[PDB]
Design a protein around this ligand. Structure first.
Ligand SMILES: *[C@@H]1O[C@H](CO)[C@@H](O[C@@H]2O[C@H](CO)[C@@H](O)[C@H](O)[C@H]2NC(C)=O)[C@H](O)[C@H]1NC(C)=O
Ligand SMILES: *[C@@H]1O[C@H](CO)[C@@H](O[C@@H]2O[C@H](CO)[C@@H](O)[C@H](O)[C@H]2NC(C)=O)[C@H](O)[C@H]1NC(C)=O
Lengths: 49, 49
């Protein structure tokens, strides 16, 4: 177990249906920012380096 | 996070303010070699190639 950051989507009944690692790749580092799973075309802003 | 959304929100309108002025032009025309259109001299207004 490692201390990373996950985003979780809950259903209508409080069941975890899907999850995203916020430290896997830059695409999934983006989904944790806007709080969505499907993200439109453009430049979005993420964390700085 | 909230500060960089504010300044990049300001910065994005500085592209929109410039496109709504100069980019009213569908097509690029060539520079005419003629510069006295009836004696009206136009070398100072056209770009000097
Ligand atoms: C959340 O749980 C409820 C149960 O309380 C689900 O509702 C039932 O779903 C079954 C199968 O779809 C139906 O046959 C029942 O008629 C439903 N009952 C009611 C009262 O709605 C519901 O589908 C669950 N939702 C999610 C997203 O898991
Ligand atoms: C438009 O006016 C300009 C004024 O600068 C004229 O340019 C000069 O013309 C003289 C004589 O033709 C030349 O000796 C200079 O070298 C020119 N200067 C430059 C910067 O080019 C130009 O001839 C005029 N054009 C027309 C069509 O009337």
């Amino acid at each position: 177990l490692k201390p990373t950051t996950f985003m979780l989507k809950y259903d209508e009944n409080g069941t975890i249906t899907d999850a995203v690692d916020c430290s896997q790749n830059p695409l999934a580092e983006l989904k944790c920012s806007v709080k969505s799973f499907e993200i439109d075309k453009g430049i979005y802003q993420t964390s700085n380096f | 996070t909230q500060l960089n959304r504010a300044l990049s929100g300001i910065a994005a309108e500085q592209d929109r303010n410039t496109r709504e002025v100069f980019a009213q032009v569908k097509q690029m025309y060539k520079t005419p070699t003629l510069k006295y259109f009836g004696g009206f001299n136009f070398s100072q207004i056209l770009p000097d190639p």
